[PDB]
Design an enzyme around this catalytic site. Structure first.
Site, PDB file in Angstrom:
ATOM      1  N   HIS A  45      33.830  25.927  21.724  1.00 12.50           N
ATOM      2  CA  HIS A  45      34.428  24.761  22.361  1.00 12.50           C
ATOM      3  C   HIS A  45      34.376  24.858  23.881  1.00 12.50           C
ATOM      4  O   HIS A  45      33.718  25.740  24.435  1.00 12.50           O
ATOM      5  CB  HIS A  45      35.863  24.526  21.862  1.00 12.50           C
ATOM      6  CG  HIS A  45      36.778  25.695  22.052  1.00 12.50           C
ATOM      7  ND1 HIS A  45      36.583  26.905  21.422  1.00 12.50           N
ATOM      8  CD2 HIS A  45      37.901  25.834  22.797  1.00 12.50           C
ATOM      9  CE1 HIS A  45      37.546  27.738  21.770  1.00 12.50           C
ATOM     10  NE2 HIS A  45      38.360  27.115  22.604  1.00 12.50           N
ATOM     11  N   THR A  48      31.082  22.038  27.080  1.00  8.70           N
ATOM     12  CA  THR A  48      29.747  22.361  27.567  1.00  8.70           C
ATOM     13  C   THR A  48      29.281  23.810  27.629  1.00  8.70           C
ATOM     14  O   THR A  48      30.078  24.741  27.758  1.00  8.70           O
ATOM     15  CB  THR A  48      29.579  21.753  28.965  1.00  8.70           C
ATOM     16  OG1 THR A  48      30.650  22.206  29.802  1.00  8.70           O
ATOM     17  CG2 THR A  48      29.627  20.231  28.888  1.00  8.70           C
ATOM     18  N   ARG A  49      27.961  23.972  27.559  1.00  8.57           N
ATOM     19  CA  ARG A  49      27.320  25.281  27.606  1.00  8.57           C
ATOM     20  C   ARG A  49      26.024  25.180  28.411  1.00  8.57           C
ATOM     21  O   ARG A  49      25.307  24.184  28.334  1.00  8.57           O
ATOM     22  CB  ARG A  49      26.998  25.766  26.189  1.00  8.57           C
ATOM     23  CG  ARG A  49      28.218  26.117  25.339  1.00  8.57           C
ATOM     24  CD  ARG A  49      28.809  27.458  25.764  1.00  8.57           C
ATOM     25  NE  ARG A  49      29.940  27.874  24.933  1.00  8.57           N
ATOM     26  CZ  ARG A  49      31.152  27.330  24.981  1.00  8.57           C
ATOM     27  NH1 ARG A  49      31.409  26.338  25.824  1.00  8.57           N
ATOM     28  NH2 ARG A  49      32.111  27.774  24.179  1.00  8.57           N
ATOM     29  N   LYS A 265      33.823  22.288  36.114  1.00  8.23           N
ATOM     30  CA  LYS A 265      34.332  23.277  35.182  1.00  8.23           C
ATOM     31  C   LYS A 265      33.837  24.652  35.604  1.00  8.23           C
ATOM     32  O   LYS A 265      32.659  24.821  35.918  1.00  8.23           O
ATOM     33  CB  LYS A 265      33.853  22.944  33.770  1.00  8.23           C
ATOM     34  CG  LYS A 265      34.183  23.993  32.734  1.00  8.23           C
ATOM     35  CD  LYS A 265      33.524  23.632  31.420  1.00  8.23           C
ATOM     36  CE  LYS A 265      33.311  24.847  30.558  1.00  8.23           C
ATOM     37  NZ  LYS A 265      32.408  24.505  29.436  1.00  8.23           N
ATOM     38  N   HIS A 269      32.829  35.093  34.092  1.00  3.29           N
ATOM     39  CA  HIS A 269      32.050  35.756  33.046  1.00  3.29           C
ATOM     40  C   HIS A 269      32.228  37.255  32.797  1.00  3.29           C
ATOM     41  O   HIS A 269      32.286  37.691  31.646  1.00  3.29           O
ATOM     42  CB  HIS A 269      30.567  35.470  33.307  1.00  3.29           C
ATOM     43  CG  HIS A 269      29.657  35.863  32.186  1.00  3.29           C
ATOM     44  ND1 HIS A 269      29.723  35.284  30.935  1.00  3.29           N
ATOM     45  CD2 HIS A 269      28.631  36.742  32.138  1.00  3.29           C
ATOM     46  CE1 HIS A 269      28.774  35.790  30.168  1.00  3.29           C
ATOM     47  NE2 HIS A 269      28.098  36.678  30.873  1.00  3.29           N
ATOM     48  N   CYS A 315      38.632  30.577  24.980  1.00  2.00           N
ATOM     49  CA  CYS A 315      37.562  30.823  24.029  1.00  2.00           C
ATOM     50  C   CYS A 315      37.224  32.321  23.959  1.00  2.00           C
ATOM     51  O   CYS A 315      37.808  33.120  24.697  1.00  2.00           O
ATOM     52  CB  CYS A 315      36.398  29.921  24.458  1.00  2.00           C
ATOM     53  SG  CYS A 315      34.714  30.328  23.960  1.00  2.00           S
ATOM     54  N   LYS A 348      23.089  28.848  23.947  1.00  2.00           N
ATOM     55  CA  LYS A 348      21.819  28.223  24.297  1.00  2.00           C
ATOM     56  C   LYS A 348      20.727  28.543  23.275  1.00  2.00           C
ATOM     57  O   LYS A 348      19.804  27.756  23.075  1.00  2.00           O
ATOM     58  CB  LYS A 348      21.367  28.676  25.689  1.00  2.00           C
ATOM     59  CG  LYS A 348      20.940  30.136  25.749  1.00  2.00           C
ATOM     60  CD  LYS A 348      20.497  30.548  27.146  1.00  2.00           C
ATOM     61  CE  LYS A 348      21.673  30.623  28.110  1.00  2.00           C
ATOM     62  NZ  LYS A 348      22.619  31.721  27.757  1.00  2.00           N
TER      63      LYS A 348
HETATM   64  C1  LIG Z   1      33.519  31.272  24.859  1.00  2.00           C
HETATM   65  C2  LIG Z   1      32.584  30.972  25.770  1.00  2.00           C
HETATM   66  C3  LIG Z   1      31.341  31.271  25.345  1.00  2.00           C
HETATM   67  C4  LIG Z   1      30.171  30.956  26.133  1.00  2.00           C
HETATM   68  C5  LIG Z   1      30.350  30.269  27.442  1.00  2.00           C
HETATM   69  C6  LIG Z   1      31.766  29.970  27.898  1.00  2.00           C
HETATM   70  C7  LIG Z   1      32.886  30.311  27.107  1.00  2.00           C
HETATM   71  C8  LIG Z   1      34.296  29.969  27.616  1.00  2.00           C
HETATM   72  N1  LIG Z   1      29.230  29.889  28.244  1.00  2.00           N
HETATM   73  C9  LIG Z   1      29.416  30.024  29.718  1.00  2.00           C
HETATM   74  O1  LIG Z   1      29.371  28.650  30.226  1.00  2.00           O
HETATM   75  C10 LIG Z   1      28.241  30.971  30.200  1.00  2.00           C
HETATM   76  C11 LIG Z   1      27.720  31.579  28.858  1.00  2.00           C
HETATM   77  C12 LIG Z   1      27.925  30.354  27.843  1.00  2.00           C
HETATM   78  C13 LIG Z   1      26.785  29.238  28.153  1.00  2.00           C
HETATM   79  O2  LIG Z   1      27.043  28.260  28.840  1.00  2.00           O
HETATM   80  N2  LIG Z   1      25.524  29.533  27.618  1.00  2.00           N
HETATM   81  C14 LIG Z   1      25.198  30.367  26.553  1.00  2.00           C
HETATM   82  O3  LIG Z   1      24.103  30.552  26.120  1.00  2.00           O
HETATM   83  N3  LIG Z   1      26.341  30.944  25.956  1.00  2.00           N
HETATM   84  C15 LIG Z   1      27.609  30.772  26.456  1.00  2.00           C
HETATM   85  N4  LIG Z   1      28.781  31.243  25.698  1.00  2.00           N
HETATM   86  C16 LIG Z   1      28.524  32.016  24.396  1.00  2.00           C
HETATM   87  C17 LIG Z   1      28.315  31.222  23.170  1.00  2.00           C
HETATM   88  O4  LIG Z   1      29.295  30.105  23.109  1.00  2.00           O
HETATM   89  C18 LIG Z   1      28.591  32.228  22.025  1.00  2.00           C
HETATM   90  O5  LIG Z   1      27.707  33.330  22.096  1.00  2.00           O
HETATM   91  C19 LIG Z   1      28.372  31.416  20.580  1.00  2.00           C
HETATM   92  O6  LIG Z   1      29.158  30.290  20.473  1.00  2.00           O
HETATM   93  C20 LIG Z   1      28.527  32.447  19.520  1.00  2.00           C
HETATM   94  O7  LIG Z   1      28.283  31.716  18.210  1.00  2.00           O
HETATM   95  P1  LIG Z   1      28.785  32.194  16.795  1.00  2.00           P
HETATM   96  O8  LIG Z   1      28.273  31.250  15.762  1.00  2.00           O
HETATM   97  O9  LIG Z   1      28.712  33.625  16.667  1.00  2.00           O
HETATM   98  O10 LIG Z   1      30.447  31.989  16.945  1.00  2.00           O
HETATM   99  P2  LIG Z   1      31.261  30.608  16.598  1.00  2.00           P
HETATM  100  O11 LIG Z   1      32.669  30.956  16.988  1.00  2.00           O
HETATM  101  O12 LIG Z   1      30.560  29.463  17.163  1.00  2.00           O
HETATM  102  O13 LIG Z   1      31.172  30.542  15.036  1.00  2.00           O
HETATM  103  C21 LIG Z   1      31.778  31.488  14.105  1.00  2.00           C
HETATM  104  C22 LIG Z   1      32.380  30.698  13.040  1.00  2.00           C
HETATM  105  O14 LIG Z   1      32.704  31.479  11.905  1.00  2.00           O
HETATM  106  C23 LIG Z   1      33.934  31.156  11.356  1.00  2.00           C
HETATM  107  N5  LIG Z   1      34.617  32.184  10.624  1.00  2.00           N
HETATM  108  C24 LIG Z   1      35.270  33.279  11.158  1.00  2.00           C
HETATM  109  N6  LIG Z   1      35.801  34.060  10.259  1.00  2.00           N
HETATM  110  C25 LIG Z   1      35.485  33.479   9.081  1.00  2.00           C
HETATM  111  C26 LIG Z   1      35.739  33.802   7.668  1.00  2.00           C
HETATM  112  N7  LIG Z   1      36.444  34.916   7.355  1.00  2.00           N
HETATM  113  N8  LIG Z   1      35.255  32.968   6.650  1.00  2.00           N
HETATM  114  C27 LIG Z   1      34.534  31.822   6.970  1.00  2.00           C
HETATM  115  N9  LIG Z   1      34.242  31.420   8.299  1.00  2.00           N
HETATM  116  C28 LIG Z   1      34.749  32.306   9.285  1.00  2.00           C
HETATM  117  C29 LIG Z   1      34.738  30.391  12.469  1.00  2.00           C
HETATM  118  O15 LIG Z   1      35.731  29.448  12.055  1.00  2.00           O
HETATM  119  C30 LIG Z   1      33.640  29.891  13.388  1.00  2.00           C
HETATM  120  O16 LIG Z   1      33.403  28.504  13.157  1.00  2.00           O
END
Ligand SMILES: *Cc1cc2c(cc1C)N1[C@H](O)CC[C@]13C(O)NC(=O)N[C@H]3N2C[C@H](O)[C@H](O)[C@H](O)COP(=O)(O)OP(=O)(O)OC[C@H]1O[C@@H](n2cnc3c(N)ncnc32)[C@H](O)[C@@H]1O
Ligand SMILES: [Cl-]
Ligand SMILES: [Cl-]
Length: 385
Positions: A45, A48-49, A265, A269, A315, A348
């Site tokens: 969330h 933006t990214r 925003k 990092h 986040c 990304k």
């Molecule tokens: C947090 C954050 C991340 C990133 C950025 C800012 C913030 C505040 N930006 C910055 O602007 C610079 C870096 C980044 C950007 O702009 N450019 C990038 O390339 N990356 C940037 N950030 C990183 C990425 O957001 C993360 O690397 C990415 O989102 C990781 O994805 P992943 O799929 O691993 O994680 P999610 O959280 O999206 O999804 C996991 C899901 O799994 C579920 N879950 C968890 N436990 C579970 C169980 N037990 N059973 C079933 N599902 C489960 C979750 O609910 C979740 O949806």
């Protein structure tokens, strides 16, 4: 009594992208998530990214970034949701004092990427609103930009479901039963089986991969971002203020131009509180560093964007020891695919990773070079229980 071809546990940035790729191929897929993606409990969330192409983290990253960019453009054409805006990405820092900047510049040269090189006052002149010392230099990527991360996951989900993929929300997977020819997951809402399994639970990977006999150092970090009232005549995307990621004496910061007057925003990092995804405090401002660390950067480098705090978000990052991702088959089970430790820079690549995960799940191989993301690499310090 419903078997599936592939089950994806964790339908977030990586998982939903994978589900879309699988569904598009007619693969009977089940996507399970602890919540309802996109949501605000994970790592996607904040609206933006940034997506850059001159990835100095490793050459393998470049091709994946370019493939992801093409996939994002495809998503834009497939959904009504806004996916990408070409704000361009500015990277700057003290001349000769930033590994990040030098690495970016090297990557740009090595891959013949179109970029602009400028320094000192040239930076301040080209982008009013930015004030850096004369000893600062920069590299600008005009073709990079900003992704609306929540829209990406939402679009991929709507598209995947329309093609037959099943999405089970608010269902936390608690354990896994893996056999040589099948996989089975256990949840409070029931058990499910399939031929292949994709594990992409984000921050929760650091707590549940142990249920897969895996012992991999993964550290979740609390990372906040803030939206500040800014001088729109300077920081608006409309006046071409770029997205950015820079390195200054006290760390790396990233930011986005104000979209529709939402305010610039910013995020810090290199620093974040070490937390657990189940006990992290998601309220912005409970730590004095949340807001102070951001304003310290703004008053010095972008004073016109140091206005009233309009919005905040909390986040998470999930770091591996070398800060490189984990994309590989489970060392003991070829029918299990792991996607973890994106260490704060994986969104990304999510479109490209979804494609990789799809290929690994279906064929056990991928056309992309994913050697540096090996689950068996030494620097990871991975082992079996
Ligand atoms: C947090 C954050 C991340 C990133 C950025 C800012 C913030 C505040 N930006 C910055 O602007 C610079 C870096 C980044 C950007 O702009 N450019 C990038 O390339 N990356 C940037 N950030 C990183 C990425 O957001 C993360 O690397 C990415 O989102 C990781 O994805 P992943 O799929 O691993 O994680 P999610 O959280 O999206 O999804 C996991 C899901 O799994 C579920 N879950 C968890 N436990 C579970 C169980 N037990 N059973 C079933 N599902 C489960 C979750 O609910 C979740 O949806
Ligand atoms: Cl500090
Ligand atoms: Cl991450």
């Amino acid at each position: 009594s419903t078997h599936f071809d592939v089950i994806v546990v964790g339908a977030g940035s990586m998982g939903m992208a994978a589900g879309y790729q699988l569904a598009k191929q007619g693969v009977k897929t089940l996507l399970v998530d602890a919540f309802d993606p996109p949501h605000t409990n994970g790592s996607h969330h904040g609206d933006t990214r940034i997506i850059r192409h001159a990835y100095g983290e490793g050459r393998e990253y470049v091709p994946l970034a370019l493939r992801s960019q093409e996939l994002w453009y495809e998503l834009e054409k497939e959904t009504h949701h806004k996916i990408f805006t070409k704000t361009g990405v500015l990277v700057f820092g003290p001349k000769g004092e930033s590994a990040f900047v030098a690495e970016t510049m090297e990557a740009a040269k090595e891959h013949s990427l179109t970029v602009d090189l400028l320094e000192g006052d040239e930076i301040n002149k080209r982008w009013p609103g930015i004030t850096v010392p004369e000893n600062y230099n920069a590299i600008f990527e005009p073709n990079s930009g900003v992704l609306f991360s929540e829209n990406c996951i939402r679009a991929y989900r709507e598209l995947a479901e329309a093609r037959g993929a099943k999405v089970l929300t608010h269902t936390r997977v608690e354990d896994f039963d893996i056999s040589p020819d099948s996989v089975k997951i256990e949840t409070a809402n029931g058990s499910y089986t399939a031929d292949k399994l994709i594990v992409s639970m984000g921050a929760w990977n650091s707590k549940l991969l142990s249920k897969l006999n895996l012992d991999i150092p993964l550290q979740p970090y609390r990372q906040v971002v803030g939206f500040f009232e800014s001088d729109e005549s300077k920081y608006s995307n409309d006046i071409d203020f770029p997205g950015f990621m820079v390195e200054v004496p006290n760390g790396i910061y990233y930011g986005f131009p104000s979209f529709g007057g939402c305010g610039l925003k910013l995020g810090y990092h290199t620093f974040g509180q070490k937390i657990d995804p189940d006990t992290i405090n998601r309220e912005f401002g409970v730590y004095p560093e949340d807001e102070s660390n951001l304003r310290a950067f703004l008053e010095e480098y972008m004073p016109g964007a140091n206005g009233e705090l309009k919005r905040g978000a909390v986040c998470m990052y999930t770091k591996t020891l070398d800060e490189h991702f984990i994309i590989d088959l489970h060392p003991e089970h070829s029918n299990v695919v792991i996607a973890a430790g994106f260490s704060g820079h994986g969104f990304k690549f999510s479109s490209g990773v979804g494609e990789v995960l799809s290929q690994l799940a279906l064929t056990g191989k991928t056309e992309h070079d994913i050697s540096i993301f090996s689950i068996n690499r030494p620097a990871l310090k991975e082992s079996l229980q």
